[PDB]
Amino acid sequence: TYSIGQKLRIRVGPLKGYLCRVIATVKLDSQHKIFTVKSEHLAE
Amino acid sequence: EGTKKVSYDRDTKIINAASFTVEREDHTIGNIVRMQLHRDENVLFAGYQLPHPLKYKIIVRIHTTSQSSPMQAYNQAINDLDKELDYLKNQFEAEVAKFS
Amino acid sequence: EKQLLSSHTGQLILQMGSDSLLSLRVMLERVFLDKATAQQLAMYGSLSLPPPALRKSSKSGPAWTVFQILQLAFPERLSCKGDRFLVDGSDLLKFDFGVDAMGSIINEIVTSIFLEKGPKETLGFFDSLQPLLMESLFAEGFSLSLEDLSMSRADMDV
Amino acid sequence: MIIPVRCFTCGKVIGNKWDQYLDLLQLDYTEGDALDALQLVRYCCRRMLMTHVDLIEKLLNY
Amino acid sequence: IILFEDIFVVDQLDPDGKKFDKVTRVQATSHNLEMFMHLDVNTEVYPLAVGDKFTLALAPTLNLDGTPDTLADKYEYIMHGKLYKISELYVSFGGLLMLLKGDPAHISHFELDQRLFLLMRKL
Amino acid sequence: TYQRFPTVKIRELKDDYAKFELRETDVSMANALRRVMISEVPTMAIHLVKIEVNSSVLNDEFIAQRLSLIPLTSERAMSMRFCQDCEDCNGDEHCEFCSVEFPLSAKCVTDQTLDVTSRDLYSADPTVTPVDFHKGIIIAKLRRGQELKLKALARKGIGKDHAKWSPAATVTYMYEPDIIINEEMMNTLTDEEKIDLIESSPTKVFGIDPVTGQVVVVDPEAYTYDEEVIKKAEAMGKPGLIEIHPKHDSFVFTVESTGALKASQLVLNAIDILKQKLDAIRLSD
Numbered sequence: 145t146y147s148i149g150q151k152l153r154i155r156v157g158p159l160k161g162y163l164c165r166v167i168a169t170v171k172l173d174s175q176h177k178i179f180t181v182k183s184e185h186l187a188e
Numbered sequence: 189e190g191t192k193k194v195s196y197d198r199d200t201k202i203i204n205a206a207s208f209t210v211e212r213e214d215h216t217i218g219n220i221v222r223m224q225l226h227r228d229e230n231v232l233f234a235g236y237q238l239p240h241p242l243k244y245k246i247i248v249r250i251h252t253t254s255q256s257s258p259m260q261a262y263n264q265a266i267n268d269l270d271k272e273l274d275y276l277k278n279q280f281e282a283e284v285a286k287f288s
Numbered sequence: 289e290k291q292l293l294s295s296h297t298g299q300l301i302l303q304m305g306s307d308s309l310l311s312l313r314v315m316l317e318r319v320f321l322d323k324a325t326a327q328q329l330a331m332y333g334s335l336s337l338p339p340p341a342l343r344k345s346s347k348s349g350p351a352w353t354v355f356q357i358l359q360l361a362f363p364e365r366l367s368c369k370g371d372r373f374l375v376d377g378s379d380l381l382k383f384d385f386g387v388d389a390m391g392s393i394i395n396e397i398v399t400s401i402f403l404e405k406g407p408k409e410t411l412g413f414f415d416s417l418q419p420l421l422m423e424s425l426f427a428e429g430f431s432l433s434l435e436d437l438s439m440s441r442a443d444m445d446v
Numbered sequence: 447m448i449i450p451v452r453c454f455t456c457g458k459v460i461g462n463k464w465d466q467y468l469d470l471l472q473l474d475y476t477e478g479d480a481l482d483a484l485q486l487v488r489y490c491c492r493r494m495l496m497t498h499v500d501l502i503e504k505l506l507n508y
Numbered sequence: 509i510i511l512f513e514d515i516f517v518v519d520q521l522d523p524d525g526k527k528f529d530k531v532t533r534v535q536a537t538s539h540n541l542e543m544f545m546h547l548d549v550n551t552e553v554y555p556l557a558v559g560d561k562f563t564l565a566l567a568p569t570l571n572l573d574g575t576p577d578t579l580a581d582k583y584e585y586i587m588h589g590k591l592y593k594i595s596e597l598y599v600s601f602g603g604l605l606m607l608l609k610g611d612p613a614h615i616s617h618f619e620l621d622q623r624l625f626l627l628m629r630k631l
Numbered sequence: 632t633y634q635r636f637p638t639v640k641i642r643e644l645k646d647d648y649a650k651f652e653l654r655e656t657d658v659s660m661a662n663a664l665r666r667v668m669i670s671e672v673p674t675m676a677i678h679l680v681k682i683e684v685n686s687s688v689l690n691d692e693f694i695a696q697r698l699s700l701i702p703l704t705s706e707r708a709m710s711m712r713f714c715q716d717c718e719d720c721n722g723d724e725h726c727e728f729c730s731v732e733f734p735l736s737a738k739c740v741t742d743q744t745l746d747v748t749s750r751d752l753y754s755a756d757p758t759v760t761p762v763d764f765h766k767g768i769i770i771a772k773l774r775r776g777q778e779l780k781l782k783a784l785a786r787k788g789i790g791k792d793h794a795k796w797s798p799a800a801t802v803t804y805m806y807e808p809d810i811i812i813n814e815e816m817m818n819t820l821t822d823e824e825k826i827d828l829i830e831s832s833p834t835k836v837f838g839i840d841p842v843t844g845q846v847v848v849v850d851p852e853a854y855t856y857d858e859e860v861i862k863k864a865e866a867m868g869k870p871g872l873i874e875i876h877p878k879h880d881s882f883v884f885t886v887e888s889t890g891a892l893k894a895s896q897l898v899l900n901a902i903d904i905l906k907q908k909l910d911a912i913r914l915s916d
């Protein structure tokens with residue numbers, strides 16, 4: 145699948161197109177929310 | 189969500205009265221409908237309420253005479269309103285054209 | 289539902305609020321309401337309002353009053369008998385009007401309601417009366433301008 | 447700070463006008479005989495110009 | 509269908525005012541009946557002068573004999589209330605008090621805790 | 632069976648202003664038009680900036696905000712698709728359907744400072760541009776050696792989620808006034824009193840006659856419903872010399888736009904989205 149520290153994109157959702165970084169469970173580049181989503185909802 | 193946008197619940201004690209809940213709507217819809225339900229002879233009581241000011245849902249209650257069921261009136265109103273708008277659109281369009 | 293009776297003053301601790309009293313006063317100042325306005329307030333009530341107060345007139349048709357709104361806000365059955373107001377099954381008979389006696393009157397009303405039926409009925413009555421009154425005022429509006437603080441130079445010289 | 451883009455009450459777009467305020471003011475126009483010729487007419491909007499402190503000229507220098 | 513019928517003349521005004529932002533408790537007397545009646549009426553919509561003649565009627569139902577509320581259209585003024593004290597008649601039209609001093613013979617048909625209506629017309 | 636028949640009659644139109652006069656409808660219709668215009672007619676505006684070299688004096692999140700509020704021409708707004716729908720994309724870059732990208736870049740390489748205005752935002756769909764009005768909306772000022780380079784992704788929205796996306800600088804109506812002067816009580820007043828009745832009107836509705844020296848309503852439209860002329864009369868004694876009350880059909884609406892959507896097509900566009908609303912609440916059977 146993926147690896148720690150990758151930069152992925154939130155494909156579908158209220159938060160779409162946001163870029164985020166995968167702490168372990170992604171974290172957004174400039175906001176404090178730690179969301180967790182499955183692989184289908186994440187893109188390079 | 190997919191819960192039906194409009195839902196119907198008959199009121200048990202009083203005949204010919206029912207309550208409709210319209211999700212994701214607010215005072216723009218409620219006030220327009222209320223005032224046309226009050227343009228009808230058969231309807232006796234009509235109003236809208238926001239269940240909590242912060243939630244977008246309206247509940248509309250209609251009490252009517254024997255001659256018409258609540259559902260009939262509600263549907264009638266909407267239909268009537270729509271037809272009004274069409275009259276305005278046509279009218280406005282005509283005017284803008286004239287101005288040019 | 290158990291600490292309503294105060295062990296300090298003896299009366300209900302659920303006293304009157306500023307906005308509540310202001311709305312009740314500006315609502316009692318106008319005894320009769322319109323049709324759409326009356327229907328829109330009852331919505332926040334508990335039950336419907338079959339009988340209208342004013343059936344037919346010269347220019348107005350069905351016109352209700354604030355008394356029936358308070359009745360539909362009142363519990364189902366109650367009998368206060370406080371030498372100034374009579375009620376029989378959510379049917380208020382008379383309601384006196386003064387400068388500040390309205391607060392004491394409604395306090396006696398709520399104390400009688402609490403001692404008759406229970407605390408849950410009073411809680412429901414308050415929860416049905418507060419948003420109704422908040423909505424009543426909201427349409428009307430209340431504010432103070434600079435004219436309210438008028439010096440009245442004649443009275444000033446006096 | 448630099449003139450805000452849109453008035454905060456009615457959302458007009460005023461952020462286009464700063465310069466022509468200043469310029470006109472550097473002729474001999476009473477503010478308000480100017481804010482008129484820039485055609486702002488509600489007072490939610492004639493606030494946002496008459497009461498802005500520039501602060502970018504400075505922040506650039508230091 | 510009308511239970512009571514009488515013509516009243518304006519005897520006196522209790523508050524002694526016109527636009528005091530309150531309902532007027534007008535005092536009236538019957539013609540050739542010796543009956544005093546007090547009533548609260550909205551004067552802003554129904555103007556009433558000092559010493560005027562008007563008709564007054566009592567009706568349990570407006571339509572024919574059956575369910576209350578064919579309809580009586582001659583009376584331009586209407587009120588809805590409920591009798592609560594048979595003994596002197598004491599009826600309040602949803603807050604508007606009404607007092608009667610008629611003899612018991614003429615008001616013997618009134619029952620306690622009944623739904624009634626007040627029909628009024630200015631001749 | 633029951634259905635009103637409203638009737639419009641435009642007075643001035645331009646691409647930003649429009650003053651139409653609806654007659655024969657309830658206020659509850661006009662309010663609805665107002666409300667929906669202010670906050671449902673959709674527009675397109677910037678909604679995810681991505682910055683690579685800010686060197687300026689203003690921090691990044693003050694450049695973002697400022698960018699978004701810039702008014703962007705959006706005739707195509709009603710035909711797009713709220714991103715949260717479009718499943719033709721991952722949400723990045725142009726998607727003919729849902730987003731349009733706007734690169735911007737600038738670096739001062741002289742002495743006198745460079746205003747990175749808005750005429751320096753370049754887009755890739757040549758539809759969604761920034762609205763042009765004479766120099767545009769300063770987004771930053773740069774001094775020698777300082778640089779900004781950003782790529783932005785516009786999107787479509789409703790002004791009830793932020794007001795970046797709302798197409799109106801105030802829509803409003805006025806119940807047209809109806810003024811009746813008692814014209815015979817007004818014969819009672821002496822000249823002076825009249826000219827202190829005239830001039831107790833905040834605005835100017837009333838006005839003396841040259842000749843007969845009578846108060847003659849001379850502009851009914853300008854009566855904010857204050858109560859001043861009335862209450863001065865009461866005080867002067869004569870009550871109800873002038874009674875002024877709303878007519879309660881005729882309104883006079885006045886729409887003004889941010890430039891994103893022409894005024895005309897703001898109104899028409901409102902009526903249209905109202906219909907689409909109503910026609911979703913039909914309960915069928």
Ligand SMILES: [Zn+2]
Nearest residue numbers: 453456490491
């Ligand atoms: Zn403004």
Ligand SMILES: [Zn+2]
Nearest residue numbers: 717720726729
């Ligand atoms: Zn897309």
